[PDB]
Symmetry: D2
Subunit: 196 residues, 4 copies
Amino acid sequence: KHSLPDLPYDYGALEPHINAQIMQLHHSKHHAAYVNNLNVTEEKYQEALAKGDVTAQIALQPALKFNGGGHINHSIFWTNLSPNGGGEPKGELLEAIKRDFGSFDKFKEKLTAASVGVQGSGWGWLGFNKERGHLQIAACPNQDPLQGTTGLIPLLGIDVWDHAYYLQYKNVRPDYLKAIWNVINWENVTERYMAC
Amino acid sequence: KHSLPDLPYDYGALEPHINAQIMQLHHSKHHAAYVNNLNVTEEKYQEALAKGDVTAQIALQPALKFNGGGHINHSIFWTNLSPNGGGEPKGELLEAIKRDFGSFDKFKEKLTAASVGVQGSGWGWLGFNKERGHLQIAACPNQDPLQGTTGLIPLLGIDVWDHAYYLQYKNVRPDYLKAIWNVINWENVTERYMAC
Amino acid sequence: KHSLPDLPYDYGALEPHINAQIMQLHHSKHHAAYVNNLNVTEEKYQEALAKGDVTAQIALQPALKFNGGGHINHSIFWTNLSPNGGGEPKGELLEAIKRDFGSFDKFKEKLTAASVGVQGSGWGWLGFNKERGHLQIAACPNQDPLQGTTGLIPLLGIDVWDHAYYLQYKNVRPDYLKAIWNVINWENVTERYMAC
Amino acid sequence: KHSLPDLPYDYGALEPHINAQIMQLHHSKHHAAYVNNLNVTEEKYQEALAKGDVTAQIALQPALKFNGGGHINHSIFWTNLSPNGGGEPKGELLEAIKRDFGSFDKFKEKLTAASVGVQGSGWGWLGFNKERGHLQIAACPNQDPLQGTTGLIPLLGIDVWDHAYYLQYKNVRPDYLKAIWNVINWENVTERYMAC
Ligand SMILES: [Mn+2]
Ligand SMILES: [Mn+2]
Ligand SMILES: [Mn+2]
Ligand SMILES: [Mn+2]
């Protein structure tokens, strides 16, 4: 059984960068739905698997990836943000960024370009490539999780689904990206990085 | 050269079903961007084609489909709505619907299910299948146009991208679908149907 | 657990339309591989599912659909062929065909066109639309199974992967299609149809 | 206008690694088809573009990518092979390889794994990442060209469509991969690399 994780702060904690209304809808409505739908889908899949019903297993793939991915992506997202975030990262994460992207500002531009360039709904990802041993930026459509579809280990995710910024920034996705840098929890990104 | 078409009514004409703010953003910002980006992309494609640069032609495919599709989809959408719409269609369109879906209410359920079931951004379409000679419902991802990708002739389109309802209905997509039936321009759908 | 099904005839029973070498490789090598990889994939999915590992489940989807689909498609294919097949169908099936495609000739023309037009590897399908209650033609890429991805019930499948004809007909897919009509088991197709 | 390129050697020059029959069919039949269909598709796209027909342009995308990609991929492939090829690369290329993949052996191991793992028809590519300045391995489905869809610059391509080996190696793709290393034109690969 999967559960909706509690937010590490108060819905209004990210203001004025991300207003309380968005945080509340995004977490208590959108994320909750994914978790609920995921549990329903997993139960159906278990039955199909027990019966060896391959057709049913393949028919359920879209619902599982969408809801399972929705749950995974958001759980990481909440930990990537903090009312005490912002600024730049330090330690070896910082040097990894300089080494792989040239500079922190260059990295920001790269991830911002990837995020803003998503057609429709999606996510912009900084991830870690275990095979090559370096940082890598990637964009994923809809709710397709980073690791499950690309193999990259997620470090920092940026949700560019409209439900993440439209109420406040409307059609100006770049304004949203500009504001989010102020609440990035770099200690969390560093932990995730040191883990892999 | 492609142009942003004028709306056949006043931004506030669809209230209280679709508020003026959404209509204004959707038309003057979102649709305008698609048209502008389409013209820029078409010009690049013409140059690539003149030079026989196949790589450049393939690299531009996503931008052309997204913006070209955005322009096509919305141009039809505006004509599908009307402050004097609502109710049910009459004439042979109505009997085609009864014949292919059983009843008008059944048709509404079918198209509503298709529209609400879109994962991420997309469109719900009632179209005409010229090969088989009957009505057909289809859902398209993001801005993928109906005819260009499926061959079906579009009759009525329902935009389920968040920029079409979120400001007003938030995460409750079903409430939006419920309201839109009140402003469907059936005379336009009938014209499109009689044309094919 | 899934098993490679035994054939209702010997490998050379369909000559000269489809030679023995192709039948032997297709069944003992290609289908066998799918069955083996499918068993391994379900095994892993069972472990991932028991541990609630959503990432692992999503990572396994491509393999499950490809090998699971391979097993489903070929299992049906073998029954669709017969050393004493060929000719035309009779009864309700022949009636449904004339009604949905005009005539047996047009149906054949349509299925052939759908099969030859597949870009790369895939399958051409005559299917049954349970929702609309009519016959329908569809093409699927690689091993994507008909019912699992489109909802249509499979009645007759034409494998257009190179391993189904290349040794005998080389690049001339049209010659392959022309020949296969001589070994279609209409009795089995009729059976599948009546079950709808 | 696009033309079928003449080969720098005769069809049987690569034996016994790749037999003459395969080379003849692959070049005079498969590549020829792509070139012919590509010319027809560009012709139609030019008409659609002049009339501002966005629907037609989008409908033509699948054909342009498939045949255009087919032409691009095979044109490069022929230059990647040589009757006096084989062995290992030298100079900067060999340096870059060891640096990005540990050693020539690991690189070979990686490219082989990527090529054999392709589900259905496709290509395994050694490419150059102009943005990151390092070598990269990638696999592409059907005829999707490397640069047009991933941005990577192609250096070496391995065609894993059945029409490239089936007549000789049947279902044993690994045997095909093992053999092709004996006819790789490292001189041409080095040339493409130095051009970056
Ligand atoms: Mn979200
Ligand atoms: Mn819209
Ligand atoms: Mn097969
Ligand atoms: Mn080839």
